[PDB]
């Protein structure tokens, strides 16, 4: 199952190519400007087989609770209404979001005690690195 090392409170320390990733998602200009300024805290927790990923920022909070491999309706930070699935592939916690015939993936893996979120849309690769608080 998901490594217990994912559990805890994480703070964004670096974000690469997030503007282009948001653009590829169809996020508008004013929203991108705020999104590039956000320094979110991500809290990953579990209750039994239900994993929760909570994102906290001044601009927007989100929260998803899911079971591995079971599709769920998600409301994203930019208010897309998606059908999403989180899976585990060789230790990586992989989220796929599908809406309006489009798709994006967010793969979260632990590297050097940090959590690295790789976000991909239309060939944009965005990397967001978090350190444990």
Annotated binding site for (9Z)-octadecenoate: 108, 128-130
Q: Of these partners, Cl ion, ligand PLM, none, which one is at the site of residue 43 (CB under 5 to 8 Å by kind)?
A: none
Question: Whose Cβ is closer to ligand PLM: residue 42's or residue 86's?
Answer: 42
Closest CA to 66 of 77, 52, 80, 81: 52
Closest CA to 63 of 18, 91, 130, 73: 73
Question: Whose Cβ is closer to ligand PLM: residue 41's or residue 68's?
Answer: 41
Q: Of these partners, Cl ion, ligand PLM, none, which one is at the site of residue 95 (CB under 5 to 8 Å by kind)?
A: none
**C-beta of 44: minimal distance to ligand PLM in Å?**
10
- SS3 assignment for the chain: CCCHHHCEEEEEEEEECHHHHHHHCCCCHHHHHHHHHCCCEEEEEEECCEEEEEEECCCCCEEEEECCCCCEEEECCCCCEEEEEEEEECCEEEEEEEECCEEEEEEEEEECCEEEEEEEECCEEEEEEEEEC
The reply on whether position 128 binds ligand PLM by CB under 6 A is yes
Ranges within 30-89 binding ligand PLM (CB under 6 A): 31, 35, 38, 40, 42, 55, 57, 59-60, 62, 76-78
The reply on whether position 106 binds ligand PLM by CB under 6 A is yes
Residues contributing to the site for ligand PLM (CB under 6 A): 22, 27, 31, 35, 38, 40, 42, 55, 57, 59-60, 62, 76-78, 106, 117, 119, 128
């Amino acid at each position: 199952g998901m490594s217990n090392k994912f559990l805890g409170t994480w703070k964004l320390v670096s974000s690469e190519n997030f503007d282009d990733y948001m653009k590829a998602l169809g996020v508008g200009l004013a929203t991108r400007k705020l999104g590039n300024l956000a320094k979110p805290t991500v809290i990953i927790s579990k209750k039994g087989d239900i994993i929760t990923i909570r994102t906290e920022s001044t601009f927007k909070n989100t929260e998803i609770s899911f079971k591995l491999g079971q599709e769920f309706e998600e409301t994203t930070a930019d208010n897309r209404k998606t059908k999403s699935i989180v899976t585990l592939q060789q230790g990586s916690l992989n989220q796929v979001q599908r809406w309006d015939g489009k798709e994006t993936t967010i793969k979260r893996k632990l590297v050097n005690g940090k959590m690295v979120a790789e976000c991909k849309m239309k060939g944009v690769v965005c990397t967001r690195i978090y350190e444990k608080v």
